[PDB]
Amino acid sequence: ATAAEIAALPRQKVELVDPPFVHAHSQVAEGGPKVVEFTMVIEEKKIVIDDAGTEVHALAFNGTVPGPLMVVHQDDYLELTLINPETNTLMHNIDFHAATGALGGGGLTEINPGEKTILRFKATKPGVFVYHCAPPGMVPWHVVSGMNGAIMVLPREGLHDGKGKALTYDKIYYVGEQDFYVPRDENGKYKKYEAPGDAYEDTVKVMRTLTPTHVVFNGAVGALTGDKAMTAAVGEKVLIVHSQANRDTRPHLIGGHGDYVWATGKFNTPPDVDQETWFIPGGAAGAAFYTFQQPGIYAYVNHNLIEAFELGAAAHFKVTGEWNDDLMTSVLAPSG
Amino acid sequence: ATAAEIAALPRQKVELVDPPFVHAHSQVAEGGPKVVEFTMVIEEKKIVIDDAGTEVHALAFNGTVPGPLMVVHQDDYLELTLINPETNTLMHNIDFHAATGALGGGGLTEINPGEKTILRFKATKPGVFVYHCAPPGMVPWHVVSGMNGAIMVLPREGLHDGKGKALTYDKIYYVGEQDFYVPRDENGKYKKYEAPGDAYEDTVKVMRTLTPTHVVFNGAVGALTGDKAMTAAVGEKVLIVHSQANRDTRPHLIGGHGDYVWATGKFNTPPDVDQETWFIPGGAAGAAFYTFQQPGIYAYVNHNLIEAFELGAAAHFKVTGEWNDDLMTSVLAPSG
Amino acid sequence: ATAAEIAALPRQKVELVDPPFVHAHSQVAEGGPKVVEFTMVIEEKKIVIDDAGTEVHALAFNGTVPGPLMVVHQDDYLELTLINPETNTLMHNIDFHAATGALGGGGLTEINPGEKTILRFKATKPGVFVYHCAPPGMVPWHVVSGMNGAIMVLPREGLHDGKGKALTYDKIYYVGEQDFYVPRDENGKYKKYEAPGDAYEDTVKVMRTLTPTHVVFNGAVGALTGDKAMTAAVGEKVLIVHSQANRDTRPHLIGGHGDYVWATGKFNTPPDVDQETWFIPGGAAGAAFYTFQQPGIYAYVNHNLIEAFELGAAAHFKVTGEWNDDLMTSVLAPSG
Ligand SMILES: [Cu+2]
Ligand SMILES: [Cu+2]
Ligand SMILES: [Cu+2]
Ligand SMILES: [Cu+2]
Ligand SMILES: [Cu+2]
Ligand SMILES: [Cu+2]
């Protein structure tokens, strides 16, 4: 595929939305290969991660933790414009696990504050993939400061089950799970700092215990609950993309299932079926497809329940519709 | 199906047995869909989890850690009478990962001391599934106090491998693996408590380290050894169902293999074959089918060997039969 | 086979090479079943594992951490002469996860210093498999002192994909991954000891935290980087065997992929494809097949990036050939 051929390809500017929502895209590919264009500005900002007012100096793609989901189709080109404003203090870059060469793009995208860059790569393999910042010598620090996201490379023909039947979701959500390592003082109280770099040494010591102080979805404890609870209706088919750029996770839809789960995140690997709890290793994304059958609230969790309910890794679904007494019924409600 | 059609179905009352054993069942379903009735009384009890006498207040389905294995076939209904006696001190409920709606059943089964409830759900998918107590605001604590078990939903046609060939076991065992988090004093010695609640605060601290003090099969270090060692014979086909409601495990039969392993625990997902070590993520059950070929003693372990041999996650099998020198032989015994 | 048939099989002595290199072998078996003979001498020695002079009393098959890769074909026999020199201080043995009976061989190979032993086993199942020392009552201690390696049991007809098309590698590397648990004094300085057994009690205390001090490839921080980077050329097909005898890992080729990954390490289990990050549970080996498409430096890591970049679990590949701008191009280089 020649430079001339690539330059002749149609282009499409895409407008990214904040997780857990996903920008407008089509499941089945519309026409031949294109160059899909994205722009993200890096925001270094304080985020409050729990109800005790614990802060993290987030290093945030598009200003969010996680960074937003980019959707392309197999054999499209993803062309990202990454911007590091003068109002930042650190060098940043970006590695796409979906990309091939130069460490996933990080070797070609190192930008000081004030600089920008434009990277283009061919999305040759279908699936969900992590992307994350990885500056040489400070890789884990940037990743666990929230500097990671994910992309989805859909097949041209959209999603299919193991045996070739089409799988079409009505809804898609992107859950980015984040392990945070927040230093404490001698009273076991979390510390605050004036600059990202001020926390480095204290944080690194915590990182080395391999024990996160917080494990959260969408940047904070309770982030995807209440006003930000995910929604569905009985009969709706929903795709849940889940990433974790540094640490293992075991997602589980409480009250539901993973009807089809690409646990590895890769669409050419046939999915697992009828899943109670799936497993996504650190440095990967997975995706699960589920048709809701019951109304009510669901909890969506990392099913190490200490991580879910002590450390923060719990989100809700609010589902509307009619209760099914065949699937489940209270024959005798709680009573003496 | 309608309420009338479910009412017309035959009902079978099952007598549960204590782990690692499993109640009488047939592998291939007998007749059409049944309503399968189980009763479990919750017992808040002091249990000893090691040879030193370290004690935990178990919150125990049917009085055991793990709770017993319930066995039904696909499209059967599981009807559970759950009873929380007046002598208990906490509210409990049950979540069936196999079930659909109301958080797996937890939203419909919250019973205080002196209360009972009857939950029915349709067993729509074949596999092994975790069940566990999950009271809102107190979820992980009930689980890591041993309030969990598993069920198996057999395919109506019994087990098959990935290519449609039937797999009939001679015997089945259920290994519930438990992570315990036991408070220590300033000498590093484990603390005892008067009531379940008294332990709460100290325990949650240990829980947050994500580092169990004990990792055990059937409620205690060495519980499945000595005259409680599991047993087999050369040529015998054994299904080992393994569950972990809170934390990852990596089961390994030392001296053997997992000939067919549904690592995800779901029978519609083709099993892995010829396994040395398989992986079960916290909040799931898996199952391994193995035909014994050599006599002698085997250790069945979680293959983090520190967890197996320091923390308690080791069981034995005693196997009768003739040694196969073709498979293995000492050409030269330990000698100068 | 019959007694005479086994006795009549060819015997072939093979010379081992140190990891990450692998001894001469054919992918397609050459002739009928063979008794493949190997010799390993056990070395107990102090090794430095980091840039700060930190020591471990290594317990090392063939004098290396990991022990060397042994390569046979399915239904060959592996015949190991294991030697424990009189200069050593500890009893050792060997467990092959690939073998059937006597705990994988440990029961038949317990050799005191001044002793040797010859074990033969039939390699009945194709795959990569952990081996490790395992003396009753001191199993994890020998393993986390580096006394572990792997073997590869190739299909007689070499490797295939899920469709049965041949996969032939140009090169094979073996990355053995090691969790070390090095004691520290109260100032946080790593302690040193005169003999292996002097470190035992302190080391077990560190092991029980389940938190390694170091996670390394080939026995040391940086052992497979710089001038010891592994090598390839664009268009070369490489198999990467990876083992972890005690603890989970999640291998990732930074800048590349795992085109075919036998994550379970078993060749009769179809490989996953297009992998970003794969998962190998503690107590197993896995294998990844990749065709390099881009020149330059790659980082091969455990993608818990803290383990990779704080704790030592990072390797390099140095790759020759011509850049492919179709796959990846810098449209605009880092600029103000
Ligand atoms: Cu960054
Ligand atoms: Cu990465
Ligand atoms: Cu309970
Ligand atoms: Cu659950
Ligand atoms: Cu040893
Ligand atoms: Cu082992």
Coordinates of N, CA and C in Angstrom, one line a residue, chain C residues 128-194:
Chain C
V128 N 4.8 -26.3 25.8 CA 5.9 -25.9 26.7 C 5.4 -26.1 28.1
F129 N 6.3 -26.6 29.0 CA 6.0 -27.0 30.4 C 7.0 -26.5 31.3
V130 N 6.6 -26.0 32.5 CA 7.5 -25.7 33.6 C 8.2 -27.0 34.1
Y131 N 9.4 -26.9 34.5 CA 10.0 -27.8 35.4 C 10.6 -27.0 36.6
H132 N 10.7 -27.6 37.8 CA 11.2 -27.0 38.9 C 11.6 -28.0 40.0
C133 N 12.6 -27.6 40.8 CA 12.9 -28.4 42.0 C 11.8 -28.3 43.0
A134 N 11.6 -29.3 43.8 CA 10.5 -29.4 44.7 C 10.7 -30.3 45.9
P135 N 11.6 -30.0 46.8 CA 11.9 -30.9 47.9 C 10.7 -30.8 48.9
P136 N 10.1 -31.9 49.4 CA 9.0 -31.9 50.4 C 9.3 -30.9 51.5
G137 N 8.4 -30.0 51.8 CA 8.6 -29.0 52.9 C 9.4 -27.8 52.6
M138 N 10.0 -27.7 51.4 CA 10.8 -26.5 51.0 C 10.6 -26.1 49.6
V139 N 9.4 -26.5 49.1 CA 9.2 -26.3 47.6 C 9.3 -24.9 47.1
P140 N 8.5 -23.9 47.6 CA 8.6 -22.6 47.1 C 9.9 -21.9 47.3
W141 N 10.6 -22.3 48.4 CA 11.9 -21.7 48.6 C 13.0 -22.1 47.6
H142 N 13.0 -23.3 47.1 CA 13.9 -23.7 46.0 C 13.5 -23.0 44.7
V143 N 12.2 -22.9 44.5 CA 11.6 -22.4 43.2 C 11.9 -20.9 43.1
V144 N 11.7 -20.1 44.2 CA 11.9 -18.7 44.2 C 13.4 -18.3 44.4
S145 N 14.3 -19.3 44.5 CA 15.7 -19.1 44.5 C 16.2 -19.4 43.1
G146 N 15.3 -19.6 42.1 CA 15.6 -19.7 40.7 C 15.7 -21.1 40.2
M147 N 15.3 -22.1 41.0 CA 15.5 -23.5 40.6 C 14.3 -24.0 39.8
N148 N 14.2 -23.4 38.6 CA 13.1 -23.7 37.7 C 13.5 -23.4 36.3
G149 N 13.0 -24.2 35.3 CA 13.1 -23.9 33.9 C 11.9 -24.3 33.2
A150 N 12.0 -24.6 31.9 CA 10.9 -25.2 31.1 C 11.4 -26.2 30.1
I151 N 10.5 -27.0 29.5 CA 10.8 -27.8 28.4 C 9.8 -27.5 27.3
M152 N 10.2 -27.9 26.1 CA 9.2 -27.8 25.0 C 9.1 -29.2 24.4
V153 N 7.8 -29.7 24.3 CA 7.4 -30.9 23.7 C 6.7 -30.5 22.4
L154 N 7.5 -30.6 21.3 CA 6.9 -30.2 20.0 C 6.0 -31.3 19.4
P155 N 5.0 -30.9 18.7 CA 4.3 -32.0 17.9 C 5.2 -32.6 16.9
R156 N 5.1 -33.9 16.7 CA 6.0 -34.6 15.7 C 6.0 -33.9 14.3
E157 N 4.9 -33.3 14.0 CA 4.8 -32.7 12.7 C 5.0 -31.1 12.8
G158 N 5.6 -30.7 13.9 CA 5.9 -29.3 14.1 C 4.7 -28.4 14.4
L159 N 4.8 -27.1 14.5 CA 3.7 -26.3 15.0 C 2.7 -25.9 13.9
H160 N 1.4 -25.8 14.3 CA 0.4 -25.4 13.3 C -0.5 -24.3 13.9
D161 N -1.2 -23.6 13.1 CA -2.2 -22.7 13.5 C -3.5 -23.4 13.8
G162 N -4.6 -22.6 14.2 CA -5.9 -23.2 14.4 C -6.5 -23.9 13.2
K163 N -6.1 -23.6 12.0 CA -6.6 -24.2 10.8 C -5.8 -25.4 10.3
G164 N -4.6 -25.6 10.9 CA -3.7 -26.7 10.6 C -2.6 -26.3 9.6
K165 N -2.5 -25.1 9.3 CA -1.4 -24.6 8.4 C -0.1 -24.5 9.3
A166 N 1.0 -25.0 8.8 CA 2.3 -25.0 9.5 C 2.8 -23.7 9.9
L167 N 3.3 -23.6 11.1 CA 4.0 -22.4 11.6 C 5.4 -22.8 11.9
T168 N 6.3 -22.2 11.1 CA 7.7 -22.6 11.2 C 8.5 -21.3 11.7
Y169 N 9.1 -21.4 12.8 CA 9.9 -20.2 13.3 C 11.4 -20.3 12.7
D170 N 11.9 -19.1 12.5 CA 13.3 -18.9 12.1 C 14.2 -19.0 13.4
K171 N 13.7 -18.5 14.5 CA 14.4 -18.4 15.7 C 13.5 -18.8 16.9
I172 N 14.1 -19.2 18.0 CA 13.4 -19.5 19.2 C 14.2 -18.9 20.4
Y173 N 13.5 -18.1 21.2 CA 14.1 -17.7 22.5 C 13.3 -18.2 23.7
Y174 N 14.0 -18.4 24.8 CA 13.3 -18.8 26.1 C 13.6 -17.7 27.1
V175 N 12.5 -17.0 27.5 CA 12.6 -16.0 28.6 C 12.0 -16.7 29.9
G176 N 12.8 -17.0 30.8 CA 12.4 -17.5 32.1 C 12.2 -16.3 33.0
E177 N 11.0 -16.2 33.7 CA 10.8 -15.0 34.5 C 10.8 -15.5 36.0
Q178 N 11.5 -14.7 36.8 CA 11.8 -15.0 38.2 C 11.3 -13.9 39.2
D179 N 10.4 -14.3 40.1 CA 10.2 -13.5 41.3 C 11.2 -13.9 42.4
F180 N 12.0 -12.9 42.9 CA 12.9 -13.0 44.0 C 12.3 -12.2 45.2
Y181 N 12.7 -12.7 46.4 CA 12.2 -12.2 47.6 C 13.4 -12.0 48.5
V182 N 14.0 -10.8 48.4 CA 15.3 -10.6 49.0 C 15.1 -9.8 50.3
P183 N 15.5 -10.3 51.5 CA 15.3 -9.7 52.8 C 16.1 -8.3 52.8
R184 N 15.5 -7.4 53.6 CA 16.1 -6.1 53.9 C 16.3 -6.0 55.4
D185 N 17.3 -5.2 55.8 CA 17.3 -4.7 57.1 C 16.3 -3.6 57.4
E186 N 16.3 -3.1 58.6 CA 15.3 -2.1 58.9 C 15.6 -0.7 58.3
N187 N 16.8 -0.5 57.7 CA 17.1 0.6 56.9 C 16.7 0.5 55.5
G188 N 16.2 -0.7 55.1 CA 15.8 -1.0 53.7 C 17.0 -1.4 52.8
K189 N 18.1 -1.8 53.4 CA 19.2 -2.3 52.6 C 19.1 -3.8 52.5
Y190 N 19.3 -4.4 51.3 CA 19.2 -5.8 51.2 C 20.3 -6.5 51.9
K191 N 19.9 -7.5 52.7 CA 20.9 -8.3 53.5 C 21.7 -9.3 52.6
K192 N 22.8 -9.7 53.1 CA 23.6 -10.8 52.5 C 23.8 -11.9 53.6
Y193 N 24.0 -13.1 53.1 CA 24.2 -14.3 53.9 C 25.3 -15.1 53.5
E194 N 25.9 -15.9 54.4 CA 27.1 -16.7 54.2 C 26.7 -18.0 53.4

